[PDB]
Amino acid sequence: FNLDVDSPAEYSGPEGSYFGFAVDFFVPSASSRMFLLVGAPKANTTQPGIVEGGQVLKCDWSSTRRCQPIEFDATGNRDYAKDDPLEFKSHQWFGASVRSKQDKILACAPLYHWRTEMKQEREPVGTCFLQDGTKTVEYAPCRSQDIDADGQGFCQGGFSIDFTKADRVLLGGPGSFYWQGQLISDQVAEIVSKYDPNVYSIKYNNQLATRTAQAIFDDSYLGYSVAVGDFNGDGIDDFVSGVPRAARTLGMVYIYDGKNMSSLYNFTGEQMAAYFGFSVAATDINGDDYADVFIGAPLFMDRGSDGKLQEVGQVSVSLQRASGDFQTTKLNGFEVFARFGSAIAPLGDLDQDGFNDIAIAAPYGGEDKKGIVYIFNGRSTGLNAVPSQILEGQWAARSMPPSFGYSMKGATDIDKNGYPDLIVGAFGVDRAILYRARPVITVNAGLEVYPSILNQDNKTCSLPGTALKVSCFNVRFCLKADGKGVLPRKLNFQVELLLDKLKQKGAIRRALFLYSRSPSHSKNMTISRGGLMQCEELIAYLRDESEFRDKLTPITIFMEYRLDYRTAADTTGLQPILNQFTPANISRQAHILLDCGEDNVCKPKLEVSVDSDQKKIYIGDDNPLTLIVKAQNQGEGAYEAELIVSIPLQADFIGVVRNNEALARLSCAFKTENQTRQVVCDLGNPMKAGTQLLAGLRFSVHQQSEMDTSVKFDLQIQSSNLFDKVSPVVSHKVDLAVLAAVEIRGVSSPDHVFLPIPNWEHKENPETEEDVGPVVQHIYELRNNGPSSFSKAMLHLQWPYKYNNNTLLYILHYDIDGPMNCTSDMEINPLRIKIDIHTLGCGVAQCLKIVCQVGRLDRGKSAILYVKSLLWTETFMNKENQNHSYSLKSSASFNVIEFPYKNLPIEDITNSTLVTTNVTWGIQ
Amino acid sequence: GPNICTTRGVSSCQQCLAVSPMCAWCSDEALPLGSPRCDLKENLLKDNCAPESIEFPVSEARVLEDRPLSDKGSGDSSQVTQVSPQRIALRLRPDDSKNFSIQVRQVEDYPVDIYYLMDLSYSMKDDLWSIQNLGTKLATQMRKLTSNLRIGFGAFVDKPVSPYMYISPPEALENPCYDMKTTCLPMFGYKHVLTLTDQVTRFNEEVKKQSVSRNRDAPEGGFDAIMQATVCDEKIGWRNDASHLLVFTTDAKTHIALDGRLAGIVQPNDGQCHVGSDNHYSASTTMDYPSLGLMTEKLSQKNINLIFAVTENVVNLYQNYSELIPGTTVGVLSMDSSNVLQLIVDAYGKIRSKVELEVRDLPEELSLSFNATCLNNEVIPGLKSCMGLKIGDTVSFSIEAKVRGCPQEKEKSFTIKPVGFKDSLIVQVTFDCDCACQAQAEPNSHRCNNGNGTFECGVCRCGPGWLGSQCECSEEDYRPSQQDECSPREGQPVCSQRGECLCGQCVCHSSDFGKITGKYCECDDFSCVRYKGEMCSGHGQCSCGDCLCDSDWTGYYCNCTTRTDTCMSSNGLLCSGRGKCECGSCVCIQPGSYGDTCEKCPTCPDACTFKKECVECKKFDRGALHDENTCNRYCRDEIESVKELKDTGKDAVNCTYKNEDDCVVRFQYYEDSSGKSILYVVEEPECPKG
Amino acid sequence: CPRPRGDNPPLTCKQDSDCLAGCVCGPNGFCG
Ligand SMILES: *[C@@H]1O[C@H](CO)[C@@H](O[C@@H]2O[C@H](CO)[C@@H](O[C@@H]3O[C@H](CO[C@@H]4O[C@H](CO)[C@@H](O[C@H]5O[C@H](CO)[C@@H](O)[C@H](O)[C@@H]5O)[C@H](O)[C@@H]4O)[C@@H](O)[C@H](O[C@H]4O[C@H](CO)[C@@H](O)[C@H](O)[C@@H]4O)[C@@H]3O)[C@H](O)[C@H]2NC(C)=O)[C@H](O)[C@H]1NC(C)=O
Ligand SMILES: *[C@@H]1O[C@H](CO)[C@@H](O[C@@H]2O[C@H](CO)[C@@H](O[C@@H]3O[C@H](CO)[C@@H](O)[C@H](O[C@H]4O[C@H](CO)[C@@H](O)[C@H](O)[C@@H]4O)[C@@H]3O)[C@H](O)[C@H]2NC(C)=O)[C@H](O)[C@H]1NC(C)=O
Ligand SMILES: *[C@@H]1O[C@H](CO)[C@@H](O[C@@H]2O[C@H](CO)[C@@H](O[C@@H]3O[C@H](CO)[C@@H](O)[C@H](O[C@H]4O[C@H](CO)[C@@H](O)[C@H](O)[C@@H]4O)[C@@H]3O)[C@H](O)[C@H]2NC(C)=O)[C@H](O)[C@H]1NC(C)=O
Ligand SMILES: *[C@@H]1O[C@H](CO)[C@@H](O[C@@H]2O[C@H](CO)[C@@H](O[C@@H]3O[C@H](CO)[C@@H](O)[C@H](O)[C@@H]3O)[C@H](O)[C@H]2NC(C)=O)[C@H](O)[C@H]1NC(C)=O
Ligand SMILES: *[C@@H]1O[C@H](CO)[C@@H](O[C@@H]2O[C@H](CO)[C@@H](O[C@@H]3O[C@H](CO)[C@@H](O)[C@H](O)[C@@H]3O)[C@H](O)[C@H]2NC(C)=O)[C@H](O)[C@H]1NC(C)=O
Ligand SMILES: *[C@@H]1O[C@H](CO)[C@@H](O[C@@H]2O[C@H](CO)[C@@H](O)[C@H](O)[C@H]2NC(C)=O)[C@H](O)[C@H]1NC(C)=O
Ligand SMILES: *[C@@H]1O[C@H](CO)[C@@H](O[C@@H]2O[C@H](CO)[C@@H](O)[C@H](O)[C@H]2NC(C)=O)[C@H](O)[C@H]1NC(C)=O
Ligand SMILES: *[C@@H]1O[C@H](CO)[C@@H](O[C@@H]2O[C@H](CO)[C@@H](O)[C@H](O)[C@H]2NC(C)=O)[C@H](O)[C@H]1NC(C)=O
Ligand SMILES: *[C@@H]1O[C@H](CO)[C@@H](O)[C@H](O)[C@H]1NC(C)=O
Ligand SMILES: *[C@@H]1O[C@H](CO)[C@@H](O)[C@H](O)[C@H]1NC(C)=O
Ligand SMILES: *[C@@H]1O[C@H](CO)[C@@H](O)[C@H](O)[C@H]1NC(C)=O
Ligand SMILES: *[C@@H]1O[C@H](CO)[C@@H](O)[C@H](O)[C@H]1NC(C)=O
Ligand SMILES: [Cl-]
Ligand SMILES: [Mn+2]
Ligand SMILES: [Mn+2]
Ligand SMILES: [Mn+2]
Ligand SMILES: [Mn+2]
Ligand SMILES: [Mn+2]
Ligand SMILES: [Mn+2]
């Protein structure tokens, strides 16, 4: 929120050169100066025969905003023979990526085409150049003898580049192995020591690189984007890369180890064609010393308010934990077709709050499609998803959209002001903008009003003029300041004081400042810095009692501070800024003495009561608990009465009841400060004597790491009196209860079989399913619906196996879906098959039982048993001839034995069901 | 008397109409009393001021053009009409809703246009079978569904640049199959070949010439073609009042937007036509591929239906792509399918199996509800779409329009129309925020007691301080004998709180962080409910303690959405037919069902129970669906009586039931193996003996 | 059978000598 948008540094390059396609800082060791690097991959050069070779420019700061090219090559196209050139540098996009470690400058040309040394071709292996002061080497790890897009022929190496802590280059080339993509890493020393201008394909020792894979991974574009950070155990930075056509254009993100280039972690996109992995970033946003992953999907389509897909782009935010896993949240864009996840740039700590910050850009958003940059401040909780500042592009299109924010670099303090700064490029207009941070000041103010309870009978200040006494008091206001970074040592503030502001609206103002004879007073104030709260004082007084009425409303003293920003010169007024989450004013109230008794002082007798009316709440669900509160003031008036209900972690405040006219609506507010959480309800100012209030407060629960066995609320009334200001604390609890609505359901599929069965013939020894009979399938489901879960339960199946020593439903096989193991008291499928009405249950038939042990079923989970049987047709012919129709009845019962909620009342949950398969003749 | 309109309407005429649609205001200019000048339409029985000077506007849903729905779309001598009405006028006073209805019909014999996009890359050498004799292949299909057919086609390979193009020895510029030791054509981005004509002869002739070209990488980027074929309206020759079908044939995967950065192409697609006299996509080398979002937009604008006619190796891919472009269909293309020579009448069948309503240019403070009557007086609330229709059916939607507050703007016209049809219902919206007497009789420095009355007709209000019907509300605290009952019951304190009543008119006006208003200052503007730390869940404005939800949100808290997409199953039915959609989440009502969309139900009866009802009404003309007249809508499966043949075991789903005649009917249904789940019935059921 | 890479079809086929790696001879005249 502290970037200076007023007067930033504008840099401009030649027309049509895509000046600003890539930006970075240059902070060498041999100079206390710092510079800007801005790539112009379309710029023209003095290289002979080379149209649009591209440049990298060194931009001076501190004055003159002058950018001079850095000449890396100056050489035209080398030759393979007399008229057979070996390389083609025209339109090579030199400068499409620029990176810098302290004195090293790495720039690349991803469209650099190369004739092979085998056959006449034009292959875009791409190249890089690494400059270190005056020494300049050529780095082209894709220009090797592995050619022709079966290998590195179309690498376009240098499409993305980066450095690690230990001076190791990371390079990405998306065209390797039929556009599978490739990563290549080399030691910077090995790059410069092994350089040989007469050798085109250079072996680098200690190189890391990915290999070709199966042709299924073709056209994945690994190396589109790269970032570095450590994710496993050491200090050795590991490799991150975006591969946005992977996984069937879902997109993916590969993380490789920094020591031996082995797969570490994977991220996969949620929606096809979104380009998940167009850009990546590594930075620690929650200050936990663990680097966190940021992945941009600029073309992501989410659901609008109506529910239609809209292209808004989405950035993935994944926080690293020590366990190795990731907590990943998501963050959608704000404007359609803005391409919100295009560039992601860590800023370091833009605010110096202790937690690093990040900037995300939507180059095609804003007004007139001129580009937007949102900055997001990190906190301990992760990233704050609500931007705190918004940078708007200022340059309108010439021919193509000024892609403001397409390239960004941060985390470098160019003005040495203590706060890092931010480069933003817009290659559509050939410009690059540098925003400078500001010195955030945190200011704490005070306001002391001497005696807050004012007697009008007590007149001591004869000072009004004309020597008549009046009832007066003092208004003392203190003001201290402090702030990290470089910023002037004495700050100037403009304090304003307003008396009784609550009725400035045309009613009479019943307190005036002594000398000025007015409600308002202002004073230019000057504090140095750092915790010495400098105070000033004034004298206000109550006008004559005859001049007004309305003694009961309080005199509110209002104080605000301004901090004129004309200070902080020294480079064009880098003006500081107050902490964003800080109040620009403080208020305090004074009361006219009234109805306080003989002691001349108001002493209340405060009581608070609470009744349950809803005696038990169940564990798994989110329960509408309503508390009825009674707040009484049986003594004298209470100044600034507030009901304070301190809720535990499980609780959330819904609101006040307004549908029971017997219960009074209250102004309640949820507050979370001073390491606590509670609800603040206004009870009157003053809360007059004998007053009784009834009101309802609704809540919600989660039970917060189960087996707690109770939720506890604490209630007390607090007032700004001097004596008897508080009520006795009243604790109210509500008992946690276990409720599990468990049910068992069953069905037969089919539920009938009509005899005779087509194409059936008695087999002496049946082998196939078709020989035995049709396929009857019983399915039993144990479904847990109630809020509370359970840990263990049993399930018993009774099955009509035989009748008069003859098979009925020959169980072939059984399956289980869920947390359950079953066991049958008889061998299943002995013969090893491959693939009125009289009821037959266990009361009249030989039964085969199956016993199942159920694990933990939660609120919406179930366990299912599939029984696949064959109708034993042979049985239903001989003595069951034609008028004998049977109902093949099975049953299943369950008993819940165990719950995870120990220490709670536990009631047994048992039930049973039955499933019939009716066999019938279709003759008579 | 003591009613909601008597609290805020007393201030002025504007603020009277604004608080409720039931409010009425009388600025007689003749009869003042001291009663509230804004009470009700009927509470102004006494103190009549009746003939004029009573301001009571009422909202109106006024039809201006409702042509009769056409019976057939084949030269009806004028204006084939698939929607009625065609134009409504809306007059809306603040916070008032007025509803209407719209009738939509997919007429029979509608004109069809078919434009073909053919992949002409090298991989397509073994796929050109599908394109020989295409015109006779196309007339033969569509003739059953329409007369007046038109066809045309174009071709695409890829961007003619590196790294896609063969720039290897210049012998490969004009013959990129040089290295293959054969010959083919130079590559091209998108080449328009044949404008839509009714001359099948010229079509087959122009098609047979076509042969393959060659580039490097398997993605081919037809999306460049899809875009230009959509937005080059005059070049392609799209006809008005004819369904527009755009067919897409390709060998393998496709380039998507942002793939062009590898080619040094960083300018986004503008969705403008760039094909000219050369019939070539000129910007193929300067402009990136189009994104799914822009393709969807330009497809819905120009009312084009995209059909993916792709080979099997890639059918799963474009299926998953079509889910991101709603209303597009995929079809397998292989000379074994028994469907390949249709492939389109099946696609056009799909596209006409649904009618969905879309809204264009909807004013922001306006919000629209929707019911749907899809089948013979079955009103379905919340739906703007009807499922499983045959070409010829007619559906109706009841629409409600609501305005929050009053924009005080000019007339605005938004469109309501079906997806993919030219026909549309245009709604003209005018808002009646101001009374009749606005600039007719208004005071300035006179017409009140002491040269301060201003601000309205009917009463004069005064300057920044000391307002009144007689212009002074003196800052003095004049002692009792002046209250005007700035309180409900006179035993209650001065105006409810936050206000010290002066001069018979409450002087609360105590700005703290939000505004305060009302004759008694009972309204808060910042005391509305919170769902989770956000007032009205962030999706609703707060006025006098009542959440006024935004366009697509409902509820006391404004936390219940009107969406039904999350309720939609993979089959197109909401909640899989077994549940109700409430606040974007299926409430499963049918027992044993659960899951996000009620899809999971293993206790539900086997499909033999639901399909037996189809064979009773289709083959025996009885049963449940026969009595409710739902047989033709719900039973879209083809039913063919068989020769008592039950032949194969390939998933072999056999059923058997017993009808009223005590005869045992048995049938089987081949599930959606090569199609859409046909079911064969064994004729000659088993009946008893004579 | 391996799938062709890039913008290439299956090779051609007269007998299964023209094709390799365990593919077939398509009636259309390709590997498949
Ligand atoms: C993040 O996601 C990444 C991609 O989504 C994951 O990377 C993938 O991990 C896979 C698991 O290791 C890996 O599959 C292995 O691939 C190698 C490749 O070496 C091969 O060597 C042979 C000759 O060069 C050829 O293999 C034969 O088999 C293939 C089919 O697999 C045939 O089609 C071929 O014609 C050939 O006859 C290949 O051409 C290739 O060059 C294999 O050696 C591995 O073999 C192992 O698996 C087999 C079972 O298939 C075992 O029996 C055997 O003992 C081996 O253990 C694997 O198949 C992918 O290549 C790799 N892809 C990429 C792009 O990196 C990554 O793991 C994941 N990380 C995390 C943390 O989740
Ligand atoms: C770096 O230097 C190179 C120098 O070669 C420069 O490239 C040149 O740019 C100009 C203008 O952008 C090109 O001139 C064009 O030439 C083509 C023919 O090849 C013409 O068709 C162009 O348009 C003409 O015709 C139109 C009618 O259809 C007219 O409407 C129009 O006004 C023109 O008359 C135009 O003349 C020139 O070809 C290139 N040279 C090359 C590519 O070799 C490049 O722009 C410089 N880059 C930067 C960043 O400064
Ligand atoms: C009648 O009214 C007059 C003024 O209207 C009033 O005079 C005030 O008297 C009080 C107490 O008698 C004075 O307040 C305190 O005086 C003592 C003197 O020892 C100080 O120690 C106090 O210091 C305060 O501030 C410190 C810094 O914040 C605190 O740390 C400390 O705890 C104290 O709060 C404080 O100044 C006050 O100064 C005078 N005011 C004037 C203008 O004379 C008198 O008390 C009233 N009497 C009756 C009977 O009504
Ligand atoms: C298969 O045959 C059995 C054998 O009867 C059927 O079982 C059910 O048995 C119960 C006995 O409790 C009966 O249900 C009763 O129905 C009467 C009305 O007919 C009702 O008044 C009772 O309160 C009770 O619900 C009945 O015999 C039978 N159930 C039904 C619904 O008829 C079983 O239903 C048969 N299965 C199939 C699929 O037909
Ligand atoms: C919007 O917010 C409100 C309140 O925050 C939610 O209402 C509360 O939740 C449900 C209604 O959805 C009500 O039912 C309660 O839950 C159990 C669940 O089994 C039910 O059996 C009980 O009857 C119990 O009352 C609850 O009363 C209700 N409370 C209030 C104060 O409204 C609502 O769910 C939210 N809606 C959405 C779409 O988020
Ligand atoms: C490549 O490096 C990784 C990590 O450095 C190796 O994986 C494990 O590394 C840890 C220490 O970092 C060892 O304690 C484990 O025993 C390693 N796993 C093994 C040996 O299976 C990995 O082994 C290295 N080599 C590869 C991937 O070939
Ligand atoms: C067993 O299941 C039955 C239902 O299958 C339930 O008991 C009955 O439930 C309904 C009320 O919801 C009524 O039929 C009776 O009032 C209940 N009978 C009772 C409570 O005895 C219940 O889920 C289980 N009941 C028992 C006794 O185990
Ligand atoms: C859509 O269906 C709803 C279903 O209730 C109906 O609208 C409401 O119906 C009941 C009346 O008993 C109440 O919820 C509301 O008074 C009705 N809303 C209105 C009149 O706007 C009605 O059939 C259809 N409503 C709309 C708005 O289309
Ligand atoms: C405070 O600063 C303003 C700024 O110009 C000036 O006008 C005023 O006189 C100053 N007052 C004091 C007391 O310094
Ligand atoms: C089922 O058996 C496995 C292996 O014996 C065991 O690990 C698992 O906990 C069992 N599940 C239940 C619910 O008993
Ligand atoms: C509005 O209410 C229902 C909603 O569908 C509609 O049928 C009815 O005709 C409308 N009533 C009026 C008076 O417009
Ligand atoms: C298509 O989507 C399904 C899930 O919806 C997935 O399992 C499948 O692999 C996808 N296939 C392709 C080709 O995208
Ligand atoms: Cl194929
Ligand atoms: Mn590491
Ligand atoms: Mn971290
Ligand atoms: Mn920070
Ligand atoms: Mn700085
Ligand atoms: Mn007292
Ligand atoms: Mn092919």
Ligand SMILES: [Mn+2]
């Ligand atoms: Mn291609």
Ligand SMILES: [Mn+2]
């Ligand atoms: Mn191809």
